[PDB]
């Protein structure tokens, strides 16, 4: 639940603003894709927790890093030339299974743990889509 609101008692006025988080230029455009049916999950990666600019969400990480979607969904190195895209949609969908089933299951991942995980996991299918891409380089094509 959220109420979608957001109201209180006169909020008292404690310390002034500081420096927040800073983005990163947009990050969103286009979408296009093409048709379901390309999702596979290779096998599960380590890799270091993610960053936004606070110390409150690195401890989140820290929380239920172990727990950090450790995997993720996406179309075998076969492609041509969006690699980028390619990760981009498929951490949308590992997170769309992962958020959709907690939900499915009950579970309720926050806006914050969210984010967590499309970086992280974005950071992982890339990683993947790139220990494989060098594999690639190798299978036969130089």
Same mark, same amino acid.
């Given at each position: 639940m959220q109420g979608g609101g957001t109201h209180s008692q006169? %909020?008292?006025?404690s310390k002034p603003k500081t420096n927040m988080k800073h983005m990163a230029? &947009? &990050? &969103?455009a286009g979408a296009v894709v093409g048709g379901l049916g390309g999702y596979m999950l290779g096998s599960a990666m380590s890799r270091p927790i993610i960053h936004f600019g606070s110390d409150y969400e690195d401890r989140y990480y820290r929380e239920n890093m172990h727990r950090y979607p450790n995997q993720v969904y996406y179309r075998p190195?076969?492609?041509?030339? %969006?690699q980028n895209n390619f990760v981009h949609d498929c951490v949308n969908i590992t997170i769309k299974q992962h958020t959709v089933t907690t939900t499915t299951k009950g579970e309720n991942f926050t806006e914050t743990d969210v984010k967590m995980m499309e970086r992280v996991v974005e950071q992982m299918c890339i990683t993947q889509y790139e220990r494989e891409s060098q594999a690639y380089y190798q299978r036969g094509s130089s």
């Open positions: 006169w %909020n008292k006025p230029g &947009a &990050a &969103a190195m076969d492609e041509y030339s %969006n």
